[PDB]
Amino acid sequence: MPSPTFGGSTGGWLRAAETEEKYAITWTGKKEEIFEIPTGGAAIMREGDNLLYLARKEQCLALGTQLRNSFKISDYKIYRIFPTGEVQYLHPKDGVFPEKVNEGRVGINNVSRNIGKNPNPISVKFTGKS
Amino acid sequence: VAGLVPCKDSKEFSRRLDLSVKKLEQRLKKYEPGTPPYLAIQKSIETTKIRFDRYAKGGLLCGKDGLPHLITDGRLSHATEFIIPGLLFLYINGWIGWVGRAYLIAIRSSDKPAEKEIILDIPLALGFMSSGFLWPLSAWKEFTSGELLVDANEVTVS
Amino acid sequence: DFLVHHAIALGLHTTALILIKGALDARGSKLMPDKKDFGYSFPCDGPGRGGTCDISAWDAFYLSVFWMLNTIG
Amino acid sequence: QEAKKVRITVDKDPVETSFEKWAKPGHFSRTLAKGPKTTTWIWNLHADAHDFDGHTSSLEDVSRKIFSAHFGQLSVIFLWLSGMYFHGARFSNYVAWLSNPTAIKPSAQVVWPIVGQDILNGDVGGGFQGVQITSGFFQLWRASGITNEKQLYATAIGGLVMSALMLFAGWFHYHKAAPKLEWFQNVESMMNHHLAGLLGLGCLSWAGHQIHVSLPINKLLDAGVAPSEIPLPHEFIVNRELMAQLYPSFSKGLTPFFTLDWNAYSDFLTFKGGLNPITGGLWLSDTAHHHLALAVLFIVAGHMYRTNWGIGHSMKEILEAHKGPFTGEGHKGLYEILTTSWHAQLAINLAMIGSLSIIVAHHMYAMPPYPYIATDYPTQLSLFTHHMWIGGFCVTGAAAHGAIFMVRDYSPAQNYNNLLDRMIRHRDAIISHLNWVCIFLGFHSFGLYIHNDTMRALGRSQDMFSDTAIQLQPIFAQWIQSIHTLAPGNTAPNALAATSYAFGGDIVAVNGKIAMMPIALGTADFMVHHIHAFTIHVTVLILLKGVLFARNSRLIPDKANLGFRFPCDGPGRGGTCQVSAWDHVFLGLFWMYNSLSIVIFHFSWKMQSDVWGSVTPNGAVSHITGGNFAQSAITINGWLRDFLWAQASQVIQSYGSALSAYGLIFLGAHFVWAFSLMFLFSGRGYWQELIESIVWAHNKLKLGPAIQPRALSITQGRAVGLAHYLVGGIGTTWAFFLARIIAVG
Amino acid sequence: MATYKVRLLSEAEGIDVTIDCADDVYILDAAEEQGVDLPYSCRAGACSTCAGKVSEGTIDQSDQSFLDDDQTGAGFVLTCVAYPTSDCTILTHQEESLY
Amino acid sequence: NNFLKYLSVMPVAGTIFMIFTAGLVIEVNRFYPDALFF
Amino acid sequence: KRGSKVRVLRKESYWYQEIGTVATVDTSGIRYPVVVRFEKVNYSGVNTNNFAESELIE
Amino acid sequence: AHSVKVYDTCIGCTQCVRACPCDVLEMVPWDGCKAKQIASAPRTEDCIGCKRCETACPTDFLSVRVYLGGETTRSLGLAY
Ligand code: CLA
Ligand code: CLA
Ligand code: CLA
Ligand code: CLA
Ligand code: CLA
Ligand SMILES: CC1=C(C/C=C(\C)CCC[C@H](C)CCC[C@H](C)CCCC(C)C)C(=O)c2ccccc2C1=O
Ligand code: SF4
Ligand code: SF4
Ligand code: SF4
Ligand code: FES
């Protein structure tokens, strides 16, 4: 699922020594557009597939959200590079955007009551619940 | 009497008449009579003298520091110092308290009441104004009519 | 001395005012009806619904030590 | 080419001057045009009043809203200038002031005796009563040479008609004839007329006013002629030979100037320099020489840029050719930056007109321009401090719109590898080395003030930093004063007197009162200038962090998508409170008052100790505070005791006098300052739940408004604690400065 | 209460109707009163699911809070704050078309 | 309408009422100054 | 119930014991099948709401 | 280590997933209203707790409660 490619830029405000979490936002373009790197600056965006290593996942999503609005392309993929070298395939989670409704339903963290219907914190005494 | 001495006959209060006009006459002796700065001081001389004859006939009650004092122990002899100022105060405080309530019922029965609170209906705001000298015999009737206070099961509450 | 006890009784009622608000609105309100599920000392509820800085009952405590030192001062 | 494309492109009658959009407010935005359902709508009506980029995306009708609104601004200046010249006519003692301006106090305000407020009208001499006043128009009107009372009455009615033309001009440029964006993007011609036909003719016709009017008036005033007995200003024009009895060069005429015998005009266009000991100010013939010196090369600097007729340095081409090895692509792209967004232009214009007015405050106290302003120490103190704070306020606005441009009008597609992009790329190394040097300065400036305070407290006075201690002598600043006293004769050989008497030379005293003494910079000024170097560096630490982290950061990578002025991005990432570029201006404005109060405190103690005072005819000099800046200025208790506690005695022992209005403002701005911290320390969600109790108290009584009474929003709540703090941080420095120097001086 | 006509058309499902509305009634309320199902979330102007595109006509859409200035410049109107002040023809099912 | 209905906006209809209701207190202090009573 | 004003009974909303204005009652077995509108807008700037059929008193 | 559980009002107004800049909200089809979808929160370990769902949430009060508990280097948002 990963591959060696490039991104094409210059920069001086990026990831430090970081070895717990990194990634690669990889996408295919269509033209030599100029886009803001979410840590700052600009880049040149080669028209094939190209990737970006950045530090933490807020920069990775905000480059994936900026690529969707301007020069619209629904093909950005987001991995996660561990210090040992394992990949994750984090963001679309099965081939599609989460604003589209899936057919694979996990359905977790779904309480089945209104937000007033929650117990008093005296009833959760010396244990962990809402 | 009622504690301290009256300032109708008080030597320290009469001393505050004395050295104030003695201070103010020292400004007068550097000018010439006939100039408009001369008339601005001598007219300001007499408005301090007549002020000191206003408090003498008013029957204010102070001593030991030459000032005037006031008594708010509900005294009807001292009713001119606090009570009838407050009775004119609480009179048409209760204008603005009542006609603001009277304005805020007929403005709710409108098409767009949100714009109408800063874009005034001046024939209605003056139309609800001058029924305000006769508020508390109508506000007490409003208190015993029933709809001055809405019920507790229909208010906004946490 | 008449007027300056009213400066104390201003600060007596106002330090009571933050904290009887601070006691009785720890549970819920219209701005946050589920404040009990968050706890006594939480930061805020975010910038939503108008913005919600100093909403907790700890931050309702926090303003009165300004007013307590203002009162006993 | 633009061989006919510098022309006027004007729409005829764009907007009908009507009344239906005049009374339906909130009409400039989609989010405000549908009425006040909440009380955010009233506070958004004022905040979006001048936010024109949130009104329309069409830059043509943005720029027509700018150009008509300047006429509304310039009509306010002429209406305010009419209030100064009319109160010189009917409400003044200026015509009595010219017969003896050495001891008669200025007055321009007669208070109505209503509530017993007539005690503020003090005995200011001249057979006249009124408020002692300190803006210094009286020494301006002697500098221009207005003698009688009629000319002040004619200028204010000539200024009111100049406002009525200027108010009409903004009406004409939005409702009858409005320019297009082609006209506004002709910036290579706008810098031509502004350099030449605004500042050159603004100097050259003013040099005509100074030579022909203000030099024969101020040559006859200081001789001792009464101002009723001076000939009129239209007698120094139609009678050339009356000017010849003052300056003999006017018997020749215009032929030395035309045939370039310009040394014949040396008798009234001189290079004396220094001061004038008869009238207490600058030599007016030097000032008459200074203006047409600037005129004859502002008009030379007017014809620099490319115009309709071929020649001229093109502004797109001198910027593009400044590329370098370190700087990447150079300035390729900045000309399209500055002729599109006004916020980019306002961010450079506010730093200049801010930090030209700080140059005004420093080039006025040590070179007093106006006659008989040198003895009047209240006017020197008020004209210093007011030109500081405008230069202190307008410099933080340079980083306001420096950050507003980045989130709105900065397109990174047009800015690949140019000079603006490269500092967004290395914005860590900009701030961190600025972050190091503020901790370096504040340990080395404020830490010495603790270190002199401890050594005085611990008894051992031989271990502080003073003259009789470990000396920190400012050897650079003591050296340049020894250069400018060799500036007569040696380095500028035709300057007769000194460039300024503050560097050295001789004292000048006018009627006993000291006009100017040499300032001896000692070891207590090595530290307080390093205070000034510290707190200036912290203000650019917040503000340049506000510009460079306006787009994004490592906290927020899409900060520009939320806007310029937003509260936060949640209490996640540990908390993002005050994260916008608005709050960097809000944090940076506070350290400006924490800067500029020290600059005017350094002014108000050094000039009360070393230059101002009294001079005995033997030559004995006795200052006001006795020269206590040599020892007591080096400790923070000495700034508390000998300056803050000691000089405020004229403020608070001033009841029953004419300065008693200042004691009320001195208690007025302690109050508003401690009204700020309710708006500043607390949050919003407390008060919204506190308002929630009060809406119950009205909905019980059928008294609730149809609009929703809400708490103030968080950027709005930080702004009202900001403006209260700067009223109560400035207004009590105002009411202590003016009350001290009018009393003791 | 005036009378106005809105020609709604969804080509993804293929339904073309002509509905009648007033100045106070919303557009999808008139679509529900003629028996046409339309996507919606809570009828507030604060979502994206109820987006239609004004092909022809004039719509007072001003009571919404989701869509910004430029995204309504192309003509994307939420059908739940819309006061139809003209006789219009509207393309619907444009919930993905705004973003 | 619409110019006198511009003089029904709450600041400007406030201010010409506030010019009135300030000056009611000013001119009673013209003719009766120095009043602690009545 | 179509049409007229319906007061609420649930807490934890902005509109508690207020007047209400019902619109388009739903029939699908949804837990909250009324999408009742209001005046006097909330903290979010949303004048509408949906709640259940157990809080009507009309 | 937050806890961003979604309650039972939950109308499927698909903008909380849009306003989430961390993809920790995800729509799940669910029997209910005419939208026929609910908002689910799988990536509670991956969230930052920046409360961006709650600002775009036009229910009675907050279909997606956020309430912040535990934390890590992911949720605290450090680039080092
Ligand atoms: C229609 C006008 C009106 C009326 C009848 C009331 C009535 C009341 N208010 Mg109130 N209030 C008002 C306007 C009004 N308010 C406004 C405009 C504000 C915002 C500044 C407040 C802020 C406020 C607070 C913060 C508190 C009250 C409280 C109270 C209650 C106790 C009385 C008191 O101390 O008043 C308080 C009065 C003020 C603080 C200042 C008066 C406000 C303005 C000047 C009055 C409005 C004048 C307006 C122009 C009238 C329009 C008429 C005409 C022009 C058409 C009482 C029920 C207190 C409470 O809950 O007690 C139960 C309380 O704590 N009010
Ligand atoms: C030599 C001609 C000349 C002069 C004197 C000015 C003077 C001015 N311009 Mg201007 N301008 C000029 C040519 C000139 N401009 C040209 C040719 C262009 C087009 C390229 C522009 C484009 C321009 C813009 C876009 C703006 C200005 C602005 C200003 C004002 C700046 C405020 C200031 O410095 O305070 C000094 C103030 C004074 C000295 C006040 C006295 C002004 C008197 C009335 C002289 C005005 C001369 C005027 C050009 C005559 C117009 C002819 C008309 C009668 C038909 C000032 C009044 C700014 C402004 O404030 O807008 C109004 C602004 O936004 N100008
Ligand atoms: C050349 C001058 C200049 C100009 C034209 C602008 C223009 C603008 N600024 Mg700006 N700014 C300036 C200088 C300037 N600024 C300076 C010098 C600073 C630093 C202090 C700032 C700081 C600043 C911020 C932080 C913000 C702006 C914003 C704005 C925009 C809208 C402003 C608005 O609607 O306010 C309407 C007018 C007011 C609200 C007036 C309030 C009056 C204040 C409180 C002072 C009153 C004190 C009074 C004079 C003395 C005491 C009174 C007494 C009662 C005690 C607009 C583009 C805002 C924006 O949205 O940008 C797009 C914004 O967020 N500016
Ligand atoms: C008097 C109150 C005060 C003090 C001392 C500080 C101190 C500081 N602020 Mg600050 N600030 C304040 C109020 C204050 N703030 C307020 C009210 C605001 C809101 C407007 C801010 C907003 C603010 C911003 C926005 C910024 C600062 C910055 C700074 C730093 C400046 C660098 C410096 O001088 O460090 C040197 C430290 C001192 C001079 C403190 C005194 C230390 C003495 C000299 C010696 C130490 C004592 C002892 C020997 C230590 C050892 C013993 C101990 C271990 C027990 C510094 C830590 C800047 C920053 O953080 O980056 C540099 C910055 O950008 N401030
Ligand atoms: C000296 C500074 C100062 C002042 C005046 C106030 C004033 C007030 N605070 Mg406050 N507060 C402050 C500092 C200050 N705070 C600080 C530092 C904190 C800590 C963060 C707080 C925390 C705080 C809390 C937590 C609470 C208050 C409350 C109150 C109110 C008390 C009721 C009262 O006295 O009614 C009288 C009102 C005043 C004395 C305010 C000043 C009114 C002026 C003098 C008159 C009106 C202005 C006048 C029109 C002048 C013309 C202005 C011109 C521009 C036209 C009042 C508004 C309580 C409250 O709101 O309950 C209702 C409350 O719960 N405050
Ligand atoms: C007290 C306080 C409030 C509450 C303040 C409010 C609600 C302002 C109330 C006063 C306004 C300005 C009254 C305006 C009334 C009009 C002037 C009309 C009056 C009638 C005549 C004068 C015309 C906040 O909203 C807030 C927000 C953020 C941080 C701190 C605070 C804060 O400390
Ligand atoms: S309001 Fe203050 S606290 Fe609540 S989120 Fe925004 S910043 Fe953080
Ligand atoms: S935000 Fe509230 S409404 Fe929109 S989906 Fe999540 S829960 Fe349903
Ligand atoms: S929690 Fe923070 S991130 Fe997850 S959705 Fe709500 S706001 Fe967006
Ligand atoms: S349907 Fe949710 S906003 Fe219109």
SS (H, E, C) D467-515: CCCCCCCCCCHHHHHHHHCCCECCCECCCCCCCCCCCCCCCEEECCEEE
Using CA of residue D237, residue D239, residue D244, residue D250, what is the dihedral sign? positive
Strands laid side by side in the E51-56 sheet = E15-21, E4-10, E88-91, E51-56, E76-78
Under a CB-based contact definition with an 8 Å cutoff, are residues G27 and E22 in contact?
Answer: no
- CA torsion sign for C22, C23, C27, C31 is negative
Q: In angstroms, rounded to a whole number, what is the distance separating the alpha carbons of residues A6 and A47?
A: 11
Gap between the Cα atoms of G7 and D477, Å rounded:
79
Nearest chain A CA: its distance from G11 CA (Å): 7
Ligand 6 — pocket residues by CB below 6 A? D 678-679, 682, 684, 687, 711-712, 717; F 14
Place of tokens 């609005």: A69
How far apart CA A69 and CA B44 sit, in angstroms, is 76
Provide the 8-state DSSP code for D263: G
3-state secondary structure D383-430: HHHHHHHHHHHHHHCCCCHHHHHHHHCCCCCCCCCCCCHHHHHCHHHH
Beta-carbon neighbour count of residue D659 at 10 Å?
Answer: 23
Q: Are strands E4-10 and E88-91 parallel, antiparallel or unpaired?
A: parallel
* C-alpha span between B98 and D706 (Å, rounded): 17
In this structure, the strands spanning E76-78 and E51-56 are antiparallel
Task: State both tokens at B45.
Answer: 């001389």
For D362, counting Cβ atoms within 10 Å of its Cβ (0-12 exposed, 13-18 middle, 19+ buried), the class is: middle
Cβ density class B75-85: b for 16+ within 10 Å, e for less: eeebebbbeee
> 3-class DSSP state for residue D130?
strand
For ligand 2, whether the C-beta of D65 sits within 6 Å is no
How remote is the C-alpha of H40 from its chain's centroid?
7
What are the strands, taking DSSP E only, across D180-236?
A: none
CB-based contact A9:A44 (threshold 8 Å): yes
Residues of chain D neighbouring C65 (CB-CB closer than 8 A): none
**Residue D193 is inside which H or E element, if any?**
helix D187-194
The pick from E29, E49, E59 for probing ligand 10's pocket by mutation, whose C-beta has the most ligand atoms within 8 angstroms, reads: E49
Chain mean position to CA G54:
11
CA dist., res. D686 & res. D682, Å (int)? 8
What is the gyration radius of the CA atoms in chain C, in angstroms? 15
The kind and range of the H/E element at E27 are helix E27-33
Put simply, the answer to whether D573 touches H51 (Cβ < 8 Å) is: no
Q: Which residues contact A37 (CB under 8 A, 6 or more apart)?
A: A9, A11, A43, A52, A54, A63
| Residues 6+ positions from D581 with CB-CB distance below 8 Å | D403, D404, D406, D407, D546, D547, D549, D550, D559, D564
Evaluate whether E82 touches E59 at the Cβ level (below 8 Å).
yes
Residue E86: other Cβ atoms inside 10 A: 13
Measure CA of the first residue to CA of the last residue in chain B; give whole Å: 55
Report how far apart, in Å, the C-alpha atoms of A26 and of each of A20, A29, D298, D650, F20 are.
20, 10, 57, 73, 71
- Helix ranges (H only) for H1-80 are 16-19
Tokens 């007596």, residue? C12
- Contacts of residue D347, Cβ cutoff 8 Å, sequence gap at least 6: D398, D399, D400, D401, D402, D405
* Residue whose tokens read 């701030």: D431
* H22 in a known ligand binding site: no
Structure letter (DSSP) for residue H62: -
Tokens of D193: 């007329």
Q: How far apart are CA D608 and CA D620, in angstroms?
A: 17
Q: Kindly report the nearest CA distance between residue G37 and chain E, in angstroms.
A: 9
CB D485 within 8 A of CB D493: no
What is chain G's length? 58
CB atoms within 10 A of CB B120: 20
User: Distance between CA atoms of D97 and D125, rounded to whole angstroms?
Assistant: 9
Q: Does C56 count as an annotated binding residue?
A: no
CA–CA separation, D442 vs D440, rounded Å? 6
Judging by beta carbons within 10 Å of its beta carbon (0-12, 13-18, 19+), is residue B42 exposed, middle or buried? middle
| Rg, C-alpha atoms of chain D | 29
Return d(Cα D191, Cα B123) in angstroms, integer: 55
Secondary structure of chain A in HEC code, one letter for each residue? CCCCCCCCECCCCCCCCCCCCECCEEEECCCCCCEECCCCCEECCCCCEEEECCCCHHHHHHHHHHHHHCCCCCCCEECCECCCCCCCCCCCCCCCCCCCCCCCCCCCCECCCCCCCCCCCCCCCCCCCC
CB atoms within 10 A of CB D622: 11
Q: Which resolution in angstroms does this entry have?
A: 3.3
Experimental method: cryo-EM
Chain F CA closest to residue D21:
F2
β A49-52/D621-623 pair status: unpaired
Cα separation, D286 vs G25, in Å, equals: 89
Tell me if residue E77 falls in helix, strand or coil. strand
- The tokens for H30 are 């669910």
Residue D606, number of CB atoms within 10 A of its CB: 22
Instruction: Report the residue count for chain B.
Output: 158
Chains with ≥3 Cβ pairs under 8 A against A?
C, D, G, H
The number of the ligand nearest the C-alpha atom of E42 reads 10
Query: CA D487 to CA D370: how far, in whole Å?
Result: 23
C-beta separation of D574 from H76 below 8 A: yes
Q: Which residue has the tokens 């590898």?
A: D417
Beta-sheet pairing, E88-91 with E83-84: unpaired
Residue D562 and residue D550 in contact, taking contact as beta carbons nearer than 8 Å: no
For residue C70 and ligand 7, the question of a CB distance below 6 A is answered with no
**Closest chain B C-alpha to G16 CA, distance in angstroms:** 6
D178, containing H or E segment = strand D177-179
**Tokens coding A68:** 């969707």
Which atom of ligand 9 sits closest to the CA of residue H22?
A: 3
Total length of chain E: 99
- In whole angstroms, give the CA distance from residue D506 to residue D351: 36
Cα gap D737→D547, rounded to integer Å:
35
> What CA–CA distance (Å, rounded) separates D434 from D546?
13
What are the backbone dihedrals phi and psi of residue D107, each rounded to the nearest 5 degrees, phi first? Answer: -150, 130
| Rounded Cα gap, residues A7 and A3, in angstroms | 12
List the beta bridge partners of residue B105. Answer: none
